[PDB]
Amino acid sequence: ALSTEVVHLRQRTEELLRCNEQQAAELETCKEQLFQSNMERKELHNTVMDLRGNIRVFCRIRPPLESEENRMCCTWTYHDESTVELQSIDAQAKSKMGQQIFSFDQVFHPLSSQSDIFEMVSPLIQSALDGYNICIFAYGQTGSGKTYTMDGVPESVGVIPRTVDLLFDSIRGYRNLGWEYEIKATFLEIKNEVLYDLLSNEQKDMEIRMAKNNKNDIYVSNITEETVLDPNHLRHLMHTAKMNRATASTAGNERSSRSHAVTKLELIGRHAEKQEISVGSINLVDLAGSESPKTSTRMTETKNINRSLSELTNVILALLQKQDHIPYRNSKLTHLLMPSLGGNSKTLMFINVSPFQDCFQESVKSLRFAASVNSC
């Protein structure tokens, strides 16, 4: 069983080599087909978004507290999942303001929790993987739930942890496609119309500057750019940035609830075999308090905040009306977000509303321009 063993082993080697050749050919074919399917679904999903959106306005109302529910609350009429009606209880308010009905992409019930958020993030992260620059806006007044929805709580995390985990599992799955994704974490604060750094305590000078490659691409000089290596690394970075942004939010309402924190995650996917590179970035940006400036103590920067908010409103409505030029350069926040606002870039617009009477004017203000955005 030795001489015939040589022939048997030669035949076995021939068969195994044939199987190797077939599996390699079909593996190259299936890699190519997987890439083709991925780009086909990229284009299909982007067409879906453009037909249904490309400027998405989402409205959410937080549930009142057990003591604040006994506090007077307005009647909330949900005509459907897309329209919500707010009616002030006051008779004179009813007579003068009349009916306040508003149209949005989707209306959140106070008991909707964070699930609808996740199922809107899923197409959002999907489009982020398409190589598209997507920006997120957490607009609203203080205490309306903006910090509850963005950062969240240990029992129910906000949008950011869910997005981080979804992105990490997505990139680890796409590693099976030979795609190597480099993700960059950038943190900055916009106060007094001058940029600051969240990762570095030392006081440096920022200036907005278009990137070397393209005029439309923008970066900021002298920022602390961190290469994300593991999810927990990113979580620790976000914790340090949240710790660095320590100031009065509700006790004094000094700078927090009056600042513009921009969280930009620049993702650069590379695939060496086909020498194609995908570039994208997500912008988790929370807005400042939209309240009317009444503190005579530091009213100037509140007026600047109002300027910033009004300029953002002007920019978005210019986006809607197909205006030839859109005033990106009127404000720092718009100017540094111009790549994420124009062209194929897609914006989610998130608004939080307070269910009490003192925010009736502010709730109406928050709702009216967003509904106007929905109209056009």
């Binding site: 003068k96 303001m97 009349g98 939209s290 009317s292 400036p293 005579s296 009213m299 007026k303 600047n304 109002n306 300027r307 908010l309 009004s310 300029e311 409103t313 002007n314 009127n330 004017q361 502010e362 109406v364 203000k365 928050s366 009216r368 321009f369």
Partner: protein, 428 residues
């Protein structure tokens, strides 16, 4: 003495008050110094010495015009601490005059008026003169008005604001100021007498036959208006009417409180000889739309109420006859639900002509405080201009950059739309 005090904000307010107070001190033979070489106590807190200080509070955010009056012939007339001055004008901003300079001087002016009120025994009401396009006259005026309504509430607050002209807007940003100040004043204004520069321009053109009219002449006219208004207090008449009866007689509803003034015998001296100036004819004249002090057509709107103030040599029989005739008129429309509104203010103190003035010496004069539907279109076009500005968000950066939100702009806009809605629904 049911005395009253007057407030003057903005260049217009101060100029108008200058003309007014010169007319007043002319009425009672008061020298510019402040002594008469009783009646006047309503407006002059005369001290032990012959120094009849007027009960006037002049406020401005820039020192120019106030300093001028502090240099004019009436510097020693006024109490030197009355004249309050800022350092920078509101520059057509409601925002400045309501948030950034207004609260920086409002404590002082409120204190001074509190002192004045405590000085008065029987407080009758307040007079304020301002504009709408004026940054001070809008922002500061609204702030002070709501502040007073907080302080007193019960007293009488009368605005002699100057409505922006329909054809000429000296300030490009007038609609914003007008809408904002109206929204913030509606709920704190007892009754706001409105007047316009274009209309009084036409009047001095075709009636005074003045070819080069200056702001002085318009101010003479407004001074005559206010003198007629206050004659019933400063003087005794067959039927005296105080400011209190005005709210009752004129406004049918809290929001509809924008009468428009009129003054009939406005002829020049040369034409004075060709007319007898009868009661009936001047009564008819005051209803001529060409004689209104606001550029609107009363012919196109029904009247809500009419208050007529007669001064000089007048007889009640004639007044009743003329009113009956006007009731018989057809072009003169009236709403049904108030079929009798003609509260009369006959008085027998003839108006006095300022030396160097343009008016003629007339035996009898009438002032008409009409309230009518014919103002709805003025609001309509003002709101239209505001919508034009706001559609492009023009100039909004100045306002949101100094105290407010464009959401607040929308609040004032929809509030005005509701006002026009209520106004027309009353009209039917």
């Amino acid at each position: 003495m049911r005395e009253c005090i007057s407030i003057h904000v903005g260049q217009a307010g101060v100029q108008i008050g200058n003309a007014c107070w010169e007319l007043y001190c002319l009425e009672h033979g008061i020298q510019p110094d402040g002594q008469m070489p009783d009646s006047f106590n309503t407006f002059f807190s005369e001290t032990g010495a012959g120094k009849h200080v007027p009960r006037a509070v002049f406020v401005d955010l820039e020192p120019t015009v106030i300093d001028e009056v502090r240099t004019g012939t009436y510097r020693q007339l006024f109490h030197p601490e009355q004249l309050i001055t800022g350092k920078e004008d509101a520059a057509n901003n409601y925002a400045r005059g309501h948030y950034t300079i207004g609260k920086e001087i409002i404590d002082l002016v409120l204190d001074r008026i509190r002192k004045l009120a405590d000085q008065c025994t029987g407080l009758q009401g307040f007079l304020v003169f301002h504009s709408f396009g004026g940054g001070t006259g809008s922002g500061f005026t609204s702030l002070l008005m709501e502040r007073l309504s907080v302080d007193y509430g019960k007293k009488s607050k009368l605005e002699f604001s100057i409505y922006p002209a329909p054809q000429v807007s000296t300030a490009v940003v007038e609609p914003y100021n007008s809408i904002l100040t109206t929204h913030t004043t509606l709920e704190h204004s007892d009754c706001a007498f409105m007047v316009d520069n274009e209309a009084i321009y036409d009047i001095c053109r075709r009636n005074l036959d003045i070819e080069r009219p200056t702001y002085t002449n318009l101010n003479r006219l407004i001074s005559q208006i206010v003198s007629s208004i206050t004659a019933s207090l400063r003087f005794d008449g067959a039927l005296n009417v105080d400011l209190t009866e005005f709210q009752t007689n004129l406004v049918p509803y809290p929001r509809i409180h924008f009468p428009l003034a009129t003054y009939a015998p406005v002829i020049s001296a040369e034409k004075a000889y060709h007319e007898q100036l009868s009661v009936a004819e001047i009564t008819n004249a005051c209803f001529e739309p060409a004689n209104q002090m606001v550029k609107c057509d009363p012919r196109h709107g029904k009247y809500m109420a009419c208050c007529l103030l007669y001064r000089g040599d007048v007889v009640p029989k004639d007044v009743n006859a003329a009113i009956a005739t006007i009731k018989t008129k057809r072009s003169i429309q009236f709403v049904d639900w108030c079929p009798t509104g003609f509260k009369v203010g006959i008085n027998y103190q003839p108006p006095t002509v300022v030396p160097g003035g343009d008016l003629a010496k007339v035996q009898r004069a009438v002032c008409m405080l009409s309230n009518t539907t014919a103002i709805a279109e003025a609001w309509a076009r003002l709101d239209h201009k505001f919508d034009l500005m706001y559609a492009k968000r023009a100039f909004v950066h100045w306002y949101v950059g100094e105290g407010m939100e464009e959401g607040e702009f929308s609040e004032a806009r929809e509030d005005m739309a509701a006002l026009e809605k209520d106004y027309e629904e009353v009209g039917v």
